[PDB]
């Protein structure tokens, strides 16, 4: 599923990401845009053999199990494929655990480089939330 900007914003808010750990909704929509282009089926292979999954490109090195990242962790107690669902519940819940580990949203490289410092509010502008 490829979300609309506002549709994703609505779904994320509904799951309580708006100002979660002090990150306003626009941050999350911004991160989703540059990580996955709002596409829940997005996958990307990393150099170390791990793989990023879903709309927030969550990495199998620590956060999910994909059966081919040896010696990794599954801190979100999920199969990585669950992060590819059209329902973003799993990705959101896992994101909440990631953003809580002490490094905030800097865990998403796309957010740090493309969202951090900018007017993230622009990403939910025009949306009925």
Annotated binding-site ranges for substrate? 101
Residue number, 30 or 58, with CB nearest to Cl ion: 58
91 lies in the site for Cl ion, by CB under 5 A? no
Span from 14-22, 38-46, 58-66, 89-97 in contact with Cl ion (CB under 5 A): 58-66
Residue number, 111 or 129, with CB nearest to Cl ion: 111
List all residues 6 or more positions away from 99 whose beta carbon is below 8 Å from its beta carbon. 20, 21, 23, 105, 107
Confirm if 15 and 92 have CB atoms less than 8 A apart.
Answer: yes
50 lies in the site for Cl ion, by CB under 5 A? no
Please say if 7 is a catalytic residue: no
Residue number, 51 or 59, with CB nearest to Cl ion: 59
Confirm if 28 and 12 have CB atoms less than 8 A apart.
Answer: yes
The distance of closest approach from Cβ of residue 55 to Cl ion in the complex, given in angstroms and rounded to an integer, is 11
60 lies in the site for Cl ion, by CB under 5 A? no
Q: DSSP secondary structure string, 6-42?
A: HHHHHHHHHTT-TTBTTB-HHHHHHHHHHHHTTBTT-
Residues that bind Cl ion (CB under 5 A): 58-59
């Amino acid at each position: 599923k490829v979300f609309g900007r506002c549709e994703l914003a609505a779904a994320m808010k509904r799951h309580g990401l708006d100002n979660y750990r002090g990150y306003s909704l626009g941050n999350w929509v911004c991160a989703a845009k540059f990580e996955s282009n709002f596409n829940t089926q997005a996958t990307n292979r990393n150099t170390d053999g791990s793989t990023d999954y879903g709309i927030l490109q969550i990495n199998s090195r620590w956060w999910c199990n994909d059966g081919r990242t040896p010696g990794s962790r599954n801190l979100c107690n999920i199969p990585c494929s669950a992060l590819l669902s059209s329902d973003i519940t799993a990705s959101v819940n896992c994101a909440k655990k990631i953003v809580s580990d002490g490094n905030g949203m800097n865990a998403w490289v796309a957010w740090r480089n493309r969202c951090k410092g900018t007017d993230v509010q622009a990403w939910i502008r025009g949306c009925r939330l």
